[PDB]
Amino acid sequence: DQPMEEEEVETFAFQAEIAQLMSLIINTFYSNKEIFLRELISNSSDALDKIRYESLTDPSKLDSGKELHINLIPNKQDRTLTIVDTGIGMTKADLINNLGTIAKSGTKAFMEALQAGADISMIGQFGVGFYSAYLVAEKVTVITKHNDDEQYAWESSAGGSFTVRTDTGEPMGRGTKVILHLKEDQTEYLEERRIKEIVKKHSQFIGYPITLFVE
Ligand SMILES: CO[C@H]1/C=C\C=C(/C)C(=O)NC2=CC(=O)C(NCCN(C)C)=C(C[C@@H](C)C[C@H](OC)[C@H](O)[C@@H](C)/C=C(\C)[C@@H]1OC(N)=O)C2=O
């Protein structure tokens, strides 16, 4: 009736500088942590620009979702804030290579900038804004579905490694879901008023609709 299923999980080590950056971010006392949302929203916009670009030539790539938008979903019960987009999504290699193992010139440049007095809010200018998620999350789970590929789950609690596996959770439409498992002292980002506030303050001019789902 219920034959056991089996799944192989792959664990990778973050490139040295990325691990260093995550450590700095996850432990920082920075007082303007709210910019994490702006960074994740900008990432979704980039993903949306990319699927839109592909649709310019191949309209069928939108069959998996014609609406290009961003959804924000807070969950107080399991203390998570999820940012979902119907962007291009990522392949398994996209996750393994571009979300952890391959060095990014911006990583060291950003840490050097901070040492030179830069502000953490500038992280996006160095192309490593995703990692700002750890300003408020103790763990980040990235669920992604690229056209013509399976759904994958990337996950890391910033202990120097991250995992990647074929997702067996709820199937999602094309796009990416960044699930922020918030730190116990950062639950304010689960509140409707707070979310509205930071979206209006840092992400009012986005090229795609953004919707907050409550209840
Ligand atoms: C975890 O989610 C993001 C993946 C990696 C992001 C990382 C490492 C990060 O910190 N910042 C980046 C933001 C980007 O927009 C971004 N896009 C290229 C350049 N324009 C912005 C100017 C990159 C480079 C690279 C990882 C893109 C992804 O590659 C599979 C993919 O091409 C794109 C589509 C994927 C993303 C931006 C993903 O976001 C969503 N929502 O899909 C960055 O590094």
Swiss-Prot record:
<feature type="binding site">
    <location>
        <position position="43"/>
    </location>
    <ligand>
        <name>ATP</name>
    </ligand>
</feature>
<comment type="subunit">
    <text>(Microbial infection) Interacts with herpes simplex virus 1 protein US11; this interaction inhibits TBK1-induced interferon production.</text>
</comment>
<comment type="similarity">
    <text>Belongs to the heat shock protein 90 family.</text>
</comment>
<feature type="modified residue" description="N6-acetyllysine">
    <location>
        <position position="76"/>
    </location>
</feature>
<feature type="binding site">
    <location>
        <position position="130"/>
    </location>
    <ligand>
        <name>ATP</name>
    </ligand>
</feature>
<feature type="binding site">
    <location>
        <position position="104"/>
    </location>
    <ligand>
        <name>ATP</name>
    </ligand>
</feature>
<feature type="modified residue" description="N6-acetyllysine">
    <location>
        <position position="50"/>
    </location>
</feature>
<comment type="subunit">
    <text>Homodimer. Identified in NR3C1/GCR steroid receptor-chaperone complexes formed at least by NR3C1, HSP90AA1 and a variety of proteins containing TPR repeats such as FKBP4, FKBP5, PPID, PPP5C or STIP1. Forms a complex containing HSP90AA1, TSC1 and TSC2; TSC1 is required to recruit TCS2 to the complex. The closed form interacts (via the middle domain and TPR repeat-binding motif) with co-chaperone TSC1 (via C-terminus). Interacts with TOM34. Interacts with TERT; the interaction, together with PTGES3, is required for correct assembly and stabilization of the TERT holoenzyme complex.</text>
</comment>
<comment type="function">
    <text>(Microbial infection) Seems to interfere with N.meningitidis NadA-mediated invasion of human cells. Decreasing HSP90 levels increases adhesion and entry of E.coli expressing NadA into human Chang cells; increasing its levels leads to decreased adhesion and invasion.</text>
</comment>
<feature type="binding site">
    <location>
        <position position="85"/>
    </location>
    <ligand>
        <name>ATP</name>
    </ligand>
</feature>
<protein>
    <recommendedName>
        <fullName>Heat shock protein HSP 90-alpha</fullName>
    </recommendedName>
</protein>
<feature type="region of interest" description="Interaction with NR3C1">
    <location>
        <begin position="1"/>
        <end position="215"/>
    </location>
</feature>
<comment type="function">
    <text>Molecular chaperone that promotes the maturation, structural maintenance and proper regulation of specific target proteins involved for instance in cell cycle control and signal transduction. Undergoes a functional cycle that is linked to its ATPase activity which is essential for its chaperone activity. This cycle probably induces conformational changes in the client proteins, thereby causing their activation. Interacts dynamically with various co-chaperones that modulate its substrate recognition, ATPase cycle and chaperone function.</text>
</comment>
